[PDB]
Amino acid sequence: MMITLDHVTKQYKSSARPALDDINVKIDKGEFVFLIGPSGSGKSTFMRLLLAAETPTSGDVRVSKFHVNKLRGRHVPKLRQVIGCVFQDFRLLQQKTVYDNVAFALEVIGKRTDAINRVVPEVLETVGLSGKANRLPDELSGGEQQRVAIARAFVNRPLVLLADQPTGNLDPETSRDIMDLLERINRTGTTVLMATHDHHIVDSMRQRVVELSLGRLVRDEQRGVYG
Amino acid sequence: MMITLDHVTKQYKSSARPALDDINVKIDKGEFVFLIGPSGSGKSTFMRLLLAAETPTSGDVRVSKFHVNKLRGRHVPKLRQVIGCVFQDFRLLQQKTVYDNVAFALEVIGKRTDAINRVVPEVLETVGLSGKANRLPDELSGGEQQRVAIARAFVNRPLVLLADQPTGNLDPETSRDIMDLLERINRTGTTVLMATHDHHIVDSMRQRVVELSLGRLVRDEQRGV
Amino acid sequence: MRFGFLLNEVLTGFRRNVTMTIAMILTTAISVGLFGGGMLVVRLADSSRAIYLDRVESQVFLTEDVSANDSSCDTTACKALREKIETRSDVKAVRFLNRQQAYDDAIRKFPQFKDVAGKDSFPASFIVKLENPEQHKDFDTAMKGQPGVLDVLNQKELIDRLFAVLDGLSNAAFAVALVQAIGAILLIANMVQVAAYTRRTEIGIMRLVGASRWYTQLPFLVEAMLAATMGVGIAVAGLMVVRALFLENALNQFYQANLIAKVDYADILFITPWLLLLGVAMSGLTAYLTLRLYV
Amino acid sequence: MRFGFLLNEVLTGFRRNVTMTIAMILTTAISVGLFGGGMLVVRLADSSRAIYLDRVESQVFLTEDVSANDSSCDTTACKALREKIETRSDVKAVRFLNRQQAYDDAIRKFPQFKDVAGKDSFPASFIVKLENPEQHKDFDTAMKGQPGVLDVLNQKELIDRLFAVLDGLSNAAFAVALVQAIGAILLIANMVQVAAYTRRTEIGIMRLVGASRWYTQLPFLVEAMLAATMGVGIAVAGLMVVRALFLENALNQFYQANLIAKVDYADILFITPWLLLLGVAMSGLTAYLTLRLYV
Amino acid sequence: AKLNELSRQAEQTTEALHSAQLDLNEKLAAQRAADQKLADNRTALDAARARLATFQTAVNKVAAATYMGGRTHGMDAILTAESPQLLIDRLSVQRVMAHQMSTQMARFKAAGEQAVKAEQAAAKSAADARSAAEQAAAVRANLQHKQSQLQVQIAVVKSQYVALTPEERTGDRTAVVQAALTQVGAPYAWGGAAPGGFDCSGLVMWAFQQAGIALPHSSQALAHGGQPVALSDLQPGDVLTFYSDASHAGIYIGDGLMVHSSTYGVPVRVVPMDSSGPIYDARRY
Ligand SMILES: Nc1ncnc2c1ncn2[C@@H]1O[C@H](COP(=O)(O)OP(=O)(O)OP(=O)(O)O)[C@@H](O)[C@H]1O
Ligand SMILES: Nc1ncnc2c1ncn2[C@@H]1O[C@H](COP(=O)(O)OP(=O)(O)OP(=O)(O)O)[C@@H](O)[C@H]1O
């Protein structure tokens, strides 16, 4: 089987409206899905549900490799090597350079230092951090501080790169190129999942756009646009 | 009677683009002022300049009362009651109530006890959430949590209510509720200084749009979309 | 304005960081309790100094027939004994002490004969003071068996070991209390940082809406006030239980040995206001500039 | 094993909060070294009691009417007891004490009470020495009211009652050590809620990168272990300078009397491994389970 | 008609001395016993003061003896001794020396308590003796007054009645049968306890005193505090004390032996035993 989850829900305490119904969603491998949902209701619990940050109350979340709804004492990172996760905030390290932030996510999973210099400097020149890559991220502008967070996710070649509000707070002049960067990971076969609240940018390429209203899916279009 | 700043500078570790260089823009009492610009512009430093929370290296700052270029620390909170700010993260206390969050600037000043509760429903009647003012803000949805953040800064009458990223994470369906609320605020007679970071609303207002690019002033005509 | 708002907001800090506040109580209790215990043994040594004899002293007595008469140094038998001890340059002075002064201090030398033990019982003394209190064993043997002297008494040459261990215990308690107070100073700076970091969500609100500068530090300073008073109170209450559980069987018989006087549950009350004005000021001087230089 | 990655982050972690770090150093040094000082006085107590077992003398008194009318043991009443005691499995030799010499041997030992001590107040006695003077329960159930004895002194608890005030000091040190050790455990417990908070920006990412669950709290543990071991390292160093500066004259003044076991630097260094393992255990067991409830 | 009442009132004056004499006797015995008990308590108080004085000299000698540095506890022996050899000897000596101290303190406290109790007992005994002397003086005070009042009736009976009335107007427990041989012709002597004066109830030695007895001669003590006797049971114990409280209780010598004087000198006639009227008149002894 491939990546398919259904019947997932997590009813929190003191919440008569947990905004998580049992929706049978279906995606395609190598296809991009845009989860432009509501505000403050359910745009992140579903987004962390693929990373299984919160244990669901019901249903069986599944990936194309193993079972996700049940774990053990040594299988929790085994889900999360293949997850490339980008938030709204930049969250770089302020004690190291841009060439070290990308490599920081490599010795934490047990990679030798000889393989660092043959893989890590073969990545950040593709995202656009080329030339010298020695500038400190504490002084760089936010246009280039986001793409290093993108390149930090694409280090072990993940098959999924889920992103929550990637543009976040940016002009369309510095967000139109973000689509041109993300399509280069999208055509590699990665099911990039973007949760956004910016219209008339996902209305251009007309890819698969889904949307929940207050806890239930209402739009399933494989080539739709945002309304 | 002018409330602006000019020939300011600010450097923390390196100069590079030292915040802003020189500002000559005419703003009036009751003007929608926008602050479109890229993320490297330092627009939050421009917020802190009018807040008198970041000391300028040069120039002067004076918002309609006195020059805060060399104002002492004794009188800096006195020029804060007339200043209002709203942010991204809604600045809400989880343990308090929806009534207790907007009834928080009352007791910190120390006004008359009869005038405490005589204004809180009077200002909850002009924000939109007139009702459901007893539920926990943790259980409230994020659409009306912003309106709590506007309605909190109405205990004292603000001469300017400057915003710092009040949308962008919100739905464009519920951005209408946020945006038209400020229109009725401006009909009281106060000015607001909008700082949104997208294109759809700035091509919807035809108001005084002020642009800023790393200190350089990009486009300034004080009208148009 | 009215203090009805300060009282019902410190309970939020009393419930938010419970694992941090009571550690401060425990370490401030140890600090001012060790300081109080160090001051108590100094008070103990100063109260017990009057029982013994000082640095320059050597007690001597008189025979019964000489001390029965001669209420003042007027008979020739007095000068006959005084002159032979002014023949040698080892001593410097002899204090005029007689029978009448030997019972008004009988309460002082031994608080066990507080009854009417009886007049005309304690011998007259005529005690001497000498600047070289090491080579006086020959002096004591010259005063042994001499026709006119009963006996001598000495509190030096390995008798005044009581004060040497009391001073050492006092300085040890003072040193451990001092380094514990240095640790307490650092925990002052940490709890205000914890209260700033966890409860920052209204500090920015009060900074924006126009709170006065002094009122911002008031909830964090009253936290340090209640922490310091609670710590000093638990330290004083701990001094009672550490005396009552296992020091009412080992310390009390020194009085029946007539070595040290009363220490009771009263002289700690004379140092408890000094413990308050030390601990609360020690907390509050160091909880002010941390909020000035960081908030 | 990727040790160089852990070797350089710990300096940045210490620079993130050196204030809380040195606070934990101080409270660890005090709580551990004060327990070590409590152990050292326990060592001194029984080690200075053990230099008396070869010289402690068990004594049993005699009744008056076998000693009031005769000086030496010549009557047939004491002729049974004179060699009944040599018929024993744990007695070296028996020496009879005449009543005439047992009066004035006290006067010869100290010329005091030469007129008030009763002539018929010191009964005659014998001499018994045991291979087990501490285990003198043999004579407790054998020396009954025999015809010729008055009472049984039951060897002596005099040395045992004498060496009990330092036992009170030892369990005082143990009580203060546990009380401050609770605060030390709590300061370990909130070490990591500010150590993880000051560097959230990378511990919040290796959760969502794929790092192992064991390797998350490992650099938040190793710095606490290093803090504990340098705290124990300065604890023994501070106990050196409270032994050699404040108690030093007190112990050298008992040096010439040879009454104390004289604990030396080898004796405090003898308890260093047990003290170090106690510090490592108290900062390892409690800096681990506080991360199971945090991360 | 006046020849009887002048001695009728005088009869109480005569018996007043005999009635008061027994009170006087018990009062003097009581004050003698009280004085003896007070003297014994004074001797006990002197002994208590002697033992208090010698134990006081002992406690002053031991209070002086500790002032020359005599330490008897044991804790400060390690503050005094310079070697473990003699430290053991110091502890061994002070262990029995403190026992001597405790016995001396207990003996002094017991002597003080005994002296206080003896002083209180001596004070109570002295108060009792002073009270007994007070009742002794009280029963003397009426005694010397009524002794002077006893001489009043002499002038009206032995002096006034002697001018007129000339020759015209005038078994085995007795063993005397006729007590009228030396008994008639004696018109009283002084109305008292004269041995031979023969005053009303003054005839008890010649009849009843035959085997010791030694009765107090009161006619009031045995009239109330005595064993009752019945005249109808052939027991001659009834007397002429009836219808007269605290009066003479003369036992008849046989049947109808009224040997007395009416006013001053009377003869004896065989008249019936008509003096026995109301109950509780006289008893046996
Ligand atoms: N840690 C939590 N514990 C309990 N309830 C939580 C927690 N986090 C969120 N919630 C609840 O979830 C709801 C918020 O929506 P949700 O968590 O699905 O994400 P969202 O607000 O839509 O997304 P985002 O966090 O990106 O704004 C509220 O009802 C809130 O009380
Ligand atoms: N407190 C500060 N310390 C150091 N540098 C600062 C500080 N504030 C601003 N800067 C500098 O100014 C630049 C932009 O400032 P600022 O944070 O106000 O930007 P902004 O336009 O509000 O955008 P954003 O919030 O998206 O970063 C930063 O990238 C940094 O180089």
Residue numbers in the entry:
A (entry chain A): 1 to 227
B (entry chain B): 1 to 225
C (entry chain C), D (entry chain D): 1 to 295
E (entry chain E): 45 to 214, 271 to 385
Please, what does the article write about this entry?
The FtsEX complex is a widely conserved regulator of peptidoglycan (PG) hydrolases. Instead, it functions as a transmembrane signal transduction system for activating PG hydrolases. Briefly, the ATPase activity by the cytoplasmic FtsE powers the system through its ATP cycle, interacting with the transmembrane FtsX. The signal is then transmitted from the cytosolic FtsE to the two extracellular loops of FtsX via conformational changes, and finally to the coiled-coil (CC) domain proteins.
To further investigate this hypothesis, we conducted a cryo-EM study on a MtbFtsEX E165Q mutant, complexed with RipC, and in the presence of ATP. In this mutant, ATP can bind but not be hydrolyzed, thereby serving as a competent mimic of the ATP-bound state preceding ATP hydrolysis. Our cryo-EM analysis yielded a 3.9 Å map of the complex, wherein the EM density for both the bound ATP and the catalytic domain of RipC was well defined. Detailed comparison of this structure with the ATP-free complex structure demonstrated that ATP binding brings the two FtsE subunits closer by about 3 Å, leading to a 2.7 Å restriction at the extracellular ECD domain. Regardless of these conformational differences, the tilting angle of RipC relative to the FtsEX central axis remained consistent, and no conformational changes were detected in RipC with the NlpC/P60 domain remain attached to the coiled-coil domain. This integrative functional and structural analysis suggests that in contrast to P. aeruginosa, ATP binding alone in Mtb is insufficient to trigger the activation of the hydrolase, indicating that further ATP hydrolysis may be required.
